[PDB]
Design a binder for this molecule. Sequence first.
Ligand SMILES: CCCCCCNC(=S)SC[C@H](NC(=O)CC[C@@H](N)C(=O)O)C(=O)NCC(=O)O
Ligand SMILES: CCCCCCNC(=S)SC[C@H](NC(=O)CC[C@@H](N)C(=O)O)C(=O)NCC(=O)O
Lengths: 217, 212
Amino acid sequence: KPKLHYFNARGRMESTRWLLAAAGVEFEEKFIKSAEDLDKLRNDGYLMFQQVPMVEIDGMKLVQTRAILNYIASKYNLYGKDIKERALIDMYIEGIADLGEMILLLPVCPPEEKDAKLALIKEKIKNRYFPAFEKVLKSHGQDYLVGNKLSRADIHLVELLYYVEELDSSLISSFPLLKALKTRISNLPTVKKFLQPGSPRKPPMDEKSLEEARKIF
Amino acid sequence: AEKPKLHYFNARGRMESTRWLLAAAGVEFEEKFIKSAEDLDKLRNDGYLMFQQVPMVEIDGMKLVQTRAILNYIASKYNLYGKDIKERALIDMYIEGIADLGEMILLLPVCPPEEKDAKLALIKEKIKNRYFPAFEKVLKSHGQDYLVGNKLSRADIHLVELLYYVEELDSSLISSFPLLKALKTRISNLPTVKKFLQPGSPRKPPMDEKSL
Ligand SMILES: CCCCCCNC(=S)SC[C@H](NC(=O)CC[C@@H](N)C(=O)O)C(=O)NCC(=O)O
Ligand SMILES: CCCCCCNC(=S)SC[C@H](NC(=O)CC[C@@H](N)C(=O)O)C(=O)NCC(=O)O
């Protein structure tokens, strides 16, 4: 079974946890706790660019978030049925990854920049990204973003809705089809299990967890 | 058959890697240059930009935005994305490293002047000690002409394009990496890439003060 190499936090590994869980794939995590443990991976040759996330799957030592996700999504048939469907999915999820990146990097922003950056994130959520995805759902009326079938785009989008809810639960309120997608995907057996207590799902990053990160990089 | 339409500004920016990839595939394409904020605004209000951003590429009945969506579709269509899922994972791992390094270089000009020379010094160190050894290691590992599967792939194209940008920043950074030197020569000599490198191609110059 796949072995996830990261530290005990959401970070750049959480979207992989979500996708594996949603595909009903059991995995182990081998958590890094120290710079000592990170250097073990580097000197043992496990990290091509000396960086985690790293996933052991099917014989490979995959680094780079998007290489991991792209491989898992094709393997478990959540990458669409042809390259035109993969292009819609890719366009959707990279928009998601652009917004996700902004939110992921808020706590490490310079303190004097944090007010502006948070404000900017909310403006783009409301005016750019949520209308973009509401218009997709409104355009075909179906229960899934692409191909009328569950795909990584639904998983990645619903994951981001949970992080937006944590930032401001009002932001999704004007977007009914996103609301309904969030509940429908949340109530899929594998996702509902992942959302319940005691799963590998990781909490928000507090301060102590934040520092113990900088102390490893 | 309609040939693909590239919507960007008349600059390298986030569109150049696609120019390289389409050209190396030997695919003819048109460019519609955005020259003002009104040109950008026209693409927004016409509904052509999913996230109100360019790059945008019209190809095969779609208006694809996001650099990585565009590149993935083009690389798959022209058989430059490996033969199976495992080869894509190697390719994806490689090109995302190139994307990481290409991003720092791309954002040198629009860094704070107090922090310019801190950033450039770190780009150079990561080149010498992180990225260039990883790819030299890949080429040494199998001793073949291409990074993956003994067949030209998007990895070779993206890597060699970056090799050109690294040379522009510091020609000495490559000198201790013979297999990267050789790949750069071999790839540049492919007929489609040699054309693209010759004058009058869609290849774009380094950005100056004027393009800012
Ligand atoms: C200051 C506090 C935190 C440090 C940086 C914020 N990122 C993290 S905490 S994630 C760990 C990080 N990995 C990546 O940046 C992934 C690359 C990316 N292309 C991908 O998608 O995989 C890492 O190993 N860095 C160590 C190092 O670079 O020497
Ligand atoms: C930036 C400092 C350095 C500037 C050099 C680069 N040039 C630009 S400005 S490229 C134009 C830009 N395009 C994107 O950001 C695309 C999204 C990206 N995730 C992709 O990969 O596609 C754009 O339209 N933003 C308008 C806007 O955000 O309102």
